[PDB]
């Protein structure tokens, strides 16, 4: 590293401290918009919903990037905010902020505080109901809001929460869809919890004027990517998939008929669907399945995928910093925990490579790096944050990791990856709260412990070289860490307390990164490919692209994109460009899809929209979203036998 | 509170410190037996069950009342303990301690470390299975142990964990019964979570040689008092069946009011408290009280709050005064109240606000809400449930908040010296507390983020408190333990600093209480009665007794019981000595049971063991356990009719 710039003098002039006198309850801090100036500090209280309580939430606004906060509590006089609700921030550049509150004395409805100018000016609005869930912006229109009342009434607002109109009265759960479509379940008898398995799923495209019952005997439903899900009670629970907003459905097809199992949707996008199916009976870990572009035909993707028995949380992770990369945890035959990583969107999984920082070697199960995610959070392990990545910060992945030793499981370490998870390196000791900013230019981290802290660990070279910085002589008990939005942001905000009086610390890094990076500061790198050969070194699902990376200890402000230029180029297909077909799987550290043993010599059939099909394949099919052309082109054929099996438990 | 005796000198010589070097993971501490001087300190690790990990738990033992601890880790080396298991301490005089462990490298089964001499000498025994749950002693015999394996197998041991024998293989939940009877549920298809509502309840009296399927279509089952409960699925509808003869004959619970949700709050040798959720799951239900057979219930309390996910309530049984119970309800203003009964659920009143209320601005404001399991489930800052002891007659210590949302975030510690009738705020902020010396000493420790070093104790039943600095190096509090015994004077605190180094502090109060109390140290008091007149002031279910209470700032050792040892005089019956009969209820602040509106002009019929009965009552029935004679005695009569209904879905 050899970092010798006097960072103390550059940061001391930029360390803006603001003391908040006597804040009771949980304190929330949020930057509002990029390059706006607006920082909100809200006071929240943990209070049961239906209980009417007295209280006054304190609100402070800064319009000068954390330098001075103005007390604007009179805006929300005689109201208070609950912790589970908090702020309702709209999409990027929408400038919309909703503050759902409750009247201090009590009322016949809630009260919101609405703003469209990046929280610079709020307006008061009395709700004709008490909200059960938080306001939900529509992905198509930020002016449209749906909410659920304490009386299970569905309320819609067309004008950014000013006027609300109830559209149904027995709603259990409502979610936005594409093009302002609202999907919601309703019941008739008693309660929602008593009629689980006997619910009706309705659709509305007119914001409450037209309805269409698209499903009966519904247990639950969800949206993911271009797919609509619904668990239907056949008693037996089966997952049905719809891509046409619920007009036509199709039952999910697995290479087996495992009755009364437990199904779960890990993730889904505009290409495919990740499904987690629990192992039969109560054995623990399940098996991941990958679907086609229609989300109907699944195949075994990864065996022994761990999950939490009560909750169902897994270590499945979306590497947002590199396309097609996903990381999760599995259990080996030695009953040790491993971290599996795929670079081809679930096509082939391989073990996570142990860090180059070799400080280690059933002794082989030891030294295996386990990246903690939602499964580790549910197991009550000391993991303060899930894996964090950003699309702007291409290749940067920061997360907690442990070793096979139970001591390292009790105290995980912070690992940094600059190639999307292919290689790792221990950079920080102990658990930390971290964030990414400046499109990956600055990475901050704060110690997570019981003692008060006062040290900022940051890095300007994408987490390659770190250096500490004391930002206060009065240590504070850490509460939260926030960053300014935008691609060229350079500020953070830390707020904590002593013993109890609160205080915030806003740090500017503009003086640290005084020089703009040049071509002698950027080293390039290519994404990892499971197949050998220089022809596809750097190809990501059939698309080869080049990426930039700051050199070690590069103290400079990067104002460029990490994807270089356009340069469209197609790669030839290979093993990494094809999923295993219906009834096929890849053995451990293998590159060929063999056929499942119990399916050899049988009729490969699966009911596709109520019509049976016969599959004749070599064991491969194209990955949904893969744009490879040429090279490997295996032969597969779907033969329509016109024989009809019932695969739709909906009207 | 004119307390000026030098507490520093008496406690400093009795404050014994011991430091533990290089401790990783959670730290448990337990006194082993009364007047034995044995203290165990165990290191536990939070590790998933089916995952085989490497680790070593450290074990320390003190045999001189916490003055010196000896490292005895070599006894349990190459093994580790999970935090969810910990120690398995038997009854007080049993001297039995079980240490369920897991082999550091992995094995075919767990390993236990058994001791019968108050943890003075342990023996090693390899289990033929991996335990899913902790060892369960039997109430009839401490030598009998049942455990549940990771493969849902039920194992029993007749000789204190020395030899184990499996008796069933598809068990979902097992519980001990009276006289070593074992009740357990089993399935057949798939898993236990999928067979909910279709389970078989079996009985065993010979530790696994003979069986008897006493129930079919079972959803759940539990034990309480002299009653066995079983949630039976009729169609689909879930109904509760009560059995007093260990499951040989059942009888469905009869209530004055479809597909609702039932819950068992508490159960005695006399009656049963039953919670029934209102149709809609709006967060509140109704408490029902039964007869001596636990069949005929009646509306005892309306709008009883419960957690929607979990079903926990604020129902608290004041063990320090017979027939007193405290729970939380929801008012018509949707504010939370604490209701208290002094006649075992016959009549409920509002908890009286403390004297000289600091909040004295509104009517619903200033109301005291005692926190219990419901507040714990609401994720409120309540470290302990209400604490009381039958030895410490009348003493109740609990956390309480006000109508303000700030007070809910930081509840205060309230003390009652009359079983819950009157209260007073004694300590600011949450605390961990304990009772000692049969009520002579009440210790309390501040709960916060900062390190602590103060012991708050009271010798006059919590009327006057005094702080005590037990260390110059403050520690982060972890746990507070007490030596068993009616005349115990020792406590054990253990915490850490900042790596992280642990330390324990054992404090003896023998020198504080050097004088035995005398006649001018005790002030007499009578229990509270809802009915007016001096003829019933002090009656508890027909028995009037006089209780003793230490004067304010009474620094002395209690020599006699707080109850004047006589034969108590019998009280004449009145309205407070009668429950509301089947189909009746008491309105708010009303002492007369009026008939339920929807039942006026109908045949009050309830199926008693498959046979109809006709109720002709004035609206009252004697409380099970009330021994009053004379006074009021309204007429009621149960005539066996000719109709024979079906009130049993079991065979
Ligand atoms: C992080 O916060 C700082 C403030 O501490 C943001 O820097 C910028 O602060 C300057 C003043 O130092 C504002 O610049 C301008 O001042 C000139 C006169 O000197 C005036 O003519 C302009 O109208 C403007 O007020 C500047 O607007 C402010 N910029 C932002 C984005 O708020 C800093 O930019 C923040 N982080 C980043 C890099 O976004
Ligand atoms: C409310 O809390 C009290 C706290 O003690 C519970 O205490 C006790 O419950 C036990 C078990 O039924 C009673 O013990 C019984 O003693 C009689 C003596 O004749 C004996 O024959 C029985 O076999 C049993 O051991 C005990 O009397 C009772 N409380 C006291 C100390 O008076 C009580 O169960 C809880 N209330 C409810 C409704 O569950
Ligand atoms: C709370 O802990 C203290 C110790 O810190 C206990 O006081 C101790 O009482 C025991 C009684 O067994 C004394 O033990 C010794 O017993 C042997 C038996 O042969 C005898 O030879 C010794 O002369 C001695 O009596 C021990 O010395 C004594 N320690 C102190 C400092 O008082 C106390 O009993 C515990 N609390 C309660 C209420 O039991
Ligand atoms: C998170 O996973 C999703 C897939 O589950 C990825 O989704 C697409 O990412 C690309 C950019 O790499 C976007 O252009 C698409 O709009 C995303 N949505 C789709 C196809 O559903 C996503 O890349 C991962 N995280 C991020 C934001 O990079
Ligand atoms: C806040 O509202 C209350 C009404 O509940 C009013 O009495 C009070 O004056 C208001 N305070 C301010 C500063 O406006
Ligand atoms: C258990 O302790 C013994 C010494 O008491 C030690 O030699 C051994 O290495 C430990 N366990 C194993 C098998 O490693």
Author numbering:
A (entry chain B): 53 to 286, 290 to 416, 420 to 557, 562 to 713
B (entry chain A): 53 to 287, 290 to 311, 314 to 416, 420 to 557, 561 to 713
Q: What does the published report state?
A:
Sortilin can trigger internalization of ligands from the cell surface via endocytosis and sorts ligands between several intracellular compartments, such as the trans-Golgi network (TGN), endosomes, lysosomes, and the secretory pathway. Sortilin binds and sorts a broad range of ligands, and dysfunction of sortilin has been linked to a wide range of disorders. Previously solved crystal structures of s-sortilin revealed that the Vps10p domain in fact consists of three domains; a ten-bladed β-propeller and two 10CC domains (10CC-a and 10CC-b) that have substantial interactions with the β-propeller. In this study, we detail that sortilin undergoes a conformational change within the three luminal domains and dimerizes while transitioning from neutral to acidic pH.
